[PDB]
């Protein structure tokens, strides 16, 4: 429900995912940083049944599969950020920022 989006991935050598809230860019993060985010959030909020973070694959990802991972990360964030205590947590607010 909250207007969190991941409208792009970018090759930079690895891939980053560009996260926006209400059309404002908040951060640019690689997949492993999302994986760490999920582990941190789940430990902090373990009484919640978290949605599945998009997973790893036994092969390198094509352009189409990077787009699918982007969509999956957006769907994940749409769910967890729409829960106030999780979306406003120190963990999430740190994640959604630039160094």
Curated annotation (Swiss-Prot):
Q: In which tissues is it expressed?
A: Widely expressed. Expressed in cells of hematopoietic origin (at protein level).
Where's it found, cell-wise?
A: Early endosome membrane; Cytoplasm, Cytosol
Q: Which residue range or ranges hold the PX domain?
A: 1-99
Highest taxon of source: Eukaryota
The task this protein performs is described as: Involved in the retrograde transport from endosome to plasma membrane, a trafficking pathway that promotes the recycling of internalized transmembrane proteins. Following internalization, endocytosed transmembrane proteins are delivered to early endosomes and recycled to the plasma membrane instead of being degraded in lysosomes.
Domain-level remarks: The PDZ domain mediates binding to a subset of proteins containing a PDZ-binding motif at the C-terminus: the specificity for PDZ-binding motif is provided by the 2 residues located upstream of the canonical PDZ-binding motif. The PDZ domain also mediates binding to the retromer complex via direct interaction with VPS26 (VPS26A or VPS26B).
Q: How does it assemble?
A: Core component of the SNX27-retromer, a multiprotein complex composed of SNX27, the WASH complex and the retromer complex. Interacts (via PDZ domain) with a number of target transmembrane proteins (via PDZ-binding motif): ABCC4, ADRB2, ARHGEF7, GRIA1, GRIA2, GRIN1, GRIN2A GRIN2C, KCNJ6, KCNJ9 and SLC2A1/GLUT1. Interacts (via the FERM-like regions) with the WASH complex. Interacts with SNX1. Interacts with CYTIP. Isoform 1 and isoform 2 directly interact with DGKZ. Isoform 1 and isoform 2 interact with HT4R isoform 5-HTA(A). Interacts with MCC.
> What's the family?
Belongs to the sorting nexin family.
Kindly provide the name given to this protein in its UniProt entry: Sorting nexin-27
Where does this protein come from, organism-wise? Homo sapiens (Human)
Q: Which residues of the full protein are shown?
A: 162 to 265 of 541
